[PDB]
Amino acid sequence: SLQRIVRVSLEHPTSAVCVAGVETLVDIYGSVPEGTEMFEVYGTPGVDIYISPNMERGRERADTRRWRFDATLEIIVVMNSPSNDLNDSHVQISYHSSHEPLPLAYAVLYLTCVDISLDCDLNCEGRQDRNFVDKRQWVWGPSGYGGILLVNCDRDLQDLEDMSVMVLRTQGPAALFDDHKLVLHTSSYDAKRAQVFHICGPEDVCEAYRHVLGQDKVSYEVPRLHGDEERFFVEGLSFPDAGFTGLISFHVTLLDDSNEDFSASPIFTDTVVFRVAPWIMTPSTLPPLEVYVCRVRNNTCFVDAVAELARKAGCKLTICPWIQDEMELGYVQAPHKTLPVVFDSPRLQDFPYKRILGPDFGYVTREPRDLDSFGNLEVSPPVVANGKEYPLGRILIGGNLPGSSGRRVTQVVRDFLHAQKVQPPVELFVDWLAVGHVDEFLSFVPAPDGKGFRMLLASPGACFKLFQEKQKCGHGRALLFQGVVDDEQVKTISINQVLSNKDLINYNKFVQSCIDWNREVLKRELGLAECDIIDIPQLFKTERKKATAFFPDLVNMLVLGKHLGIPKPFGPIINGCCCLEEKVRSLLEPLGLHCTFIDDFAGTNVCRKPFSFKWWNMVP
Amino acid sequence: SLQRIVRVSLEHPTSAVCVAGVETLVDIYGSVPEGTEMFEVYGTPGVDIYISPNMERGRERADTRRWRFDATLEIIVVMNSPSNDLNDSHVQISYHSSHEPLPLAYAVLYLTCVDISLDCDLNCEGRQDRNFVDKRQWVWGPSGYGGILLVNCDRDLQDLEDMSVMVLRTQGPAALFDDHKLVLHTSSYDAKRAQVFHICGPEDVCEAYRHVLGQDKVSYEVPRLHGDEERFFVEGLSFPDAGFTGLISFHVTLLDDSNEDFSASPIFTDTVVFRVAPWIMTPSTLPPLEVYVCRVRNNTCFVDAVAELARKAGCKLTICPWIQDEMELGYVQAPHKTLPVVFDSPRLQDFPYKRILGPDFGYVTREPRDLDSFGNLEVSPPVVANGKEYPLGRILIGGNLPGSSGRRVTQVVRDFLHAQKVQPPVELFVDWLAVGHVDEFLSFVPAPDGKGFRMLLASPGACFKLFQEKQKCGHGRALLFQGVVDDEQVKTISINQVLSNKDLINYNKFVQSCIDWNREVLKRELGLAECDIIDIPQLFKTERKKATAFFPDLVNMLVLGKHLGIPKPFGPIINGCCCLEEKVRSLLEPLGLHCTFIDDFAGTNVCRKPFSFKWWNMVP
Known part of the structure; x- marks a missing residue:
């Protein structure tokens, strides 16, 4: 599946964001203390912790015994439910020797879980056994999948019924989005072939569907107005031609912009692929x-x-x-x-x-x-x-x-x-x-x-x-x-x-x-x-x-x-x-x-x- | 395989051209004489004649017995070797009844065979040993085939070493080409992505390779200068891009323009497919x-x-x-x-x-x-x-x-x-x-x-x-x-x-x-x-x-x-x-x-x- 590395420090605690369901590989920055022979890991309820040798697949629960230290072992952390508040969960890794009862050192990782997903109607009624679908692909055939976009005008109101719906789920503590931003984006190539309207109010006003992705608009910072999810309406603008195969892709990226002295960094990306x-x-x-x-x-x-x-x-x-x-x-x-x-x-x-x-x-x-x-x-x-x-x-x-x-x-x-x-x-x-x-x-x-x-x-x-x-x-x-x-x-x-x-x-x-x-x-x-x-x-x-x-x-x-x-x-x-x-x-x-x-x-x-x-x- | 219909007349003889190996379906224009119960078919040596029920595959030799007349039977004619002179072969279909010894009527078809083929290096060293190879296709993979074209300059002497060779075989009586023409052609789309030079002299002169297919040139009437075959050199002009998948096709078409008061008509087409x-x-x-x-x-x-x-x-x-x-x-x-x-x-x-x-x-x-x-x-x-x-x-x-x-x-x-x-x-x-x-x-x-x-x-x-x-x-x-x-x-x-x-x-x-x-x-x-x-x-x-x-x-x-x-x-x-x-x-x-x-x-x-x-x- 998807894996992301989060580094921790023996010297001070760390705070990190994990996306629900995504495996987080936790490891320290530097070396373990001298004399380290064993280690233990603990997590607050709701934090799944596993270990796996880095050369073998599969995993097993890591929080039930004291392990022999082995640098080739990986510590895997998963949270499946969004956090209610920032840093409401944590993991501790403690390194031990058989000579003293207290840990030689330990690393603390505070965790905020968010559920972020960009989804469309993949047309998987009986076609490809949902959840084993590569969202970056559009597959033809009686066992395929993928979103479909309609184009009703190509020269090269309430027309929402012909557009395709794209939903962005953003469950998590609101304060996180004070330092993290959601960017909906698409390539300029695809941008000049489709446009996207973000609904920013009731479903009865025609000027509440604001044009957020279009010809020159290739990126858009999403405001979390309607609580846990934002709905987008995609409108195709070009039929397939000699220079357009018909595929249009949209992505959402969660960016960590909390470090004022550093630059922004991505944490998660999701993708939706339409075919015209x-x-x-x-x-x-x-x-x-x-x-x-x-x-x-x-x-x-x-x-x-x-x-x-x-x-x-x-x-x-x-x-x-x-x-x-x-x-x-x-x-x-x-x-x-x-x-x-x-x-x-x-x-x-x-x-x-x-x-x-x-x-x-x-x-x-x-x-x-x-x-x-x-x-x-x-x-x-x-x-x-x-x-x-x-x-x-x-x-x-x-x-x-x-x-x-x-x-x-x-x-x-x-x-x-x-x-x-x-x-x-x-x-x-x-x-x-x-x-x-x-x-x-x-x-x-x-x-x-x-x-x-x-x-x-x-x-x-x-x-x-x-x-x-x-x-x-x-x-x-x-x-x-x-x-x-x-x-x-x-x-x-x-x-x-x-x-x-x-x-x-x-x-x-x-x-x-x-x-x-x-x-x-x-x-x-x-x-x-x-x-x-x-x-x-x-x-x-x-x-x-x-x-x-x-x-x-x-x-x-x-x-x-x-x-x-x-x-x-x-x-x-x-x-x-x-x-x-x-x-x-x-x-x-x-x-x-x-x-x-x-x-x-x-x-x-x-x-x-x-x-x-x-x-x-x-x-x- | 490939099949072409040639119609004959009970009232007068017909003359036709057959491409070597191509099955010619022979049938009359009008109705058989009243009282027709049986038929026979004869051909000169080198003309293979078969019959086949039109609802069944397969065939068998037709020139060895008298058949019961059945309108659902098809008569198939094949010539495998080019003719030395015009109308040097013929087929006769005679319709019979059991009451009089002479045929009620008969149809005569004079035949001129020509061997026409447009070929490139299909890169078929192995993988296919071509016998089910569609020359209109370019197939990827370790069991594929297709011509390959190199592009050494794309801004968007002895350059023969980078070009691809395309050979046109046109064996047959010369007089036929007084009334039939060979047209080498390509689409305008492909035309503005590649060019073709026809060698019209010795292999040592640089102005003997005449530019015959190019940007505005989408068709070219081929003169039979070097006897049985002509050589063309194809030079690619564009790499694959967002509007070009890399396929380039060339065709040769034999056109019958002998029938005055009528219009020209195609008799045969061959194709070569290159990939850049x-x-x-x-x-x-x-x-x-x-x-x-x-x-x-x-x-x-x-x-x-x-x-x-x-x-x-x-x-x-x-x-x-x-x-x-x-x-x-x-x-x-x-x-x-x-x-x-x-x-x-x-x-x-x-x-x-x-x-x-x-x-x-x-x-x-x-x-x-x-x-x-x-x-x-x-x-x-x-x-x-x-x-x-x-x-x-x-x-x-x-x-x-x-x-x-x-x-x-x-x-x-x-x-x-x-x-x-x-x-x-x-x-x-x-x-x-x-x-x-x-x-x-x-x-x-x-x-x-x-x-x-x-x-x-x-x-x-x-x-x-x-x-x-x-x-x-x-x-x-x-x-x-x-x-x-x-x-x-x-x-x-x-x-x-x-x-x-x-x-x-x-x-x-x-x-x-x-x-x-x-x-x-x-x-x-x-x-x-x-x-x-x-x-x-x-x-x-x-x-x-x-x-x-x-x-x-x-x-x-x-x-x-x-x-x-x-x-x-x-x-x-x-x-x-x-x-x-x-x-x-x-x-x-x-x-x-x-x-x-x-x-x-x-x-x-x-x-x-x-x-x-x-x-x-x-x-x-």
């Missing part, structure tokens, strides 16, 4: 809570369809004065509160997130060092791949090909995503698309069996097979885009005409290969097999040299639990029904999913429930 | 190679004594136009070269290190964000503490007390030291000293037994005991400072007069307690027992509330192997001999150490051999 909760993305397989549609007027059809879908799913709907391309809705999590946090990047000014999104919403942003769209960013369901477990899924980044002059995801955003460390990113090939969003060829829907989900991929090959099957069944003259309402630039085309267009078929073969590259990347990096993948029939055309959807992109869907909002494809009408819609239904309805095809020919984002898996139980 | 070698401090227990004396004139005694000590130790001596307070001599290590590196902090201009220190010397510096002296920094021998092993020792940092207005070690230096990560630092209490250097109370000397060393601590208590013993033996009137040459303000003082000075004895008792704090810190953090510690008798006096040596500081010694240069203490002369020198000899000579007491009533730094333990085998 990372920003976590939510895949489309998590249950929805609120759907956000942002920028459309004169588009009551879209709003009404999204509202009907949300009512069928059971989640609320909110309209705000785009939200899916310049914003991503994640969350931060602590044992005491879960906060949704929006990551913003407007391809500006201070965004009012507490009113547009909600009162319990956080905000994080990153300015470039010199993102195109958050459609370049998705995240997978929980997966296992290459022996490594990813209980919060993996972020999916659609970047640009090596050697290209343009960049889709700036370096600062990639650094932020990797610094969250809980959703290790996977790079995808999207340069073949005209826009280049991951959702244009990829989607995740919940499923009752297998891995609990299916990965949907746009597939020109599946559409080839569907059209060949329909042609063999005598429906080759069925017309695509027949269900559209007679527009001047919407010309119908038959299954035969599509299958006979060599340029279109060859281009869709190329697009299928482009998607196959990502298919194998995802199978390797998400540990997926073919039975986890559903190929959605989807054709593409060339917005010259880049791909765009031939008919509305079926996989670019809105997933609200088991209810799907799917763009209406306007495919070939066979027996008065769209065979593309029928194929999608035959593929997805067996999974218990409900398909709603919405007429699509401006942005939608969903706030979802967090993962059931707690991020601090992960081992990255 | 950290800066490592050398404790005084490591063997010396060269002693550096810097700044003194008119003191031939100091230079002559250091030269005699170095001659007895066997190490060179060098004088240069301070070196221990503003510079620290560590080293960086790779399997191919070990470089001593100076960390500089001039309490200026570009310091010429290759001439003042030596040709094989590196340089590191850190500007403050707004250290007092490198005497605030020491390092321990290898230790084991709290179950954790520290095979390169632990750095010792003498900082200021919490709440003090001054700082001894700036935050940038602490961040650098912690970011090296291989010598986890320990904080020590030095504010009680007038100067505040760790060496004023601490030293490490080699020892033949125990842990292989002894930690020496200045100890007023040991001097108390020595003087009490000498007084009891009748030598109380022996005079300190009798060996002085009768200079002004240098008054002799007897053992009795020292022991009878209550203020001096009390102040040295306080100093002993200040040292005891560090004694317990070091015992805990270095896993030391009392048998590892030697208390050197040392008295202190007060420079106005701060400690300075009463007589010359014995523990502030120069350790050259088993030869010790110890400041001459000028202690009490008993029987014509200094009893302090005699006590130090009785303490240290049994360890096989040779004590030379040097008149010290100028800076000295030592360049030492590196640790025998290789840093990459550590698990931090």
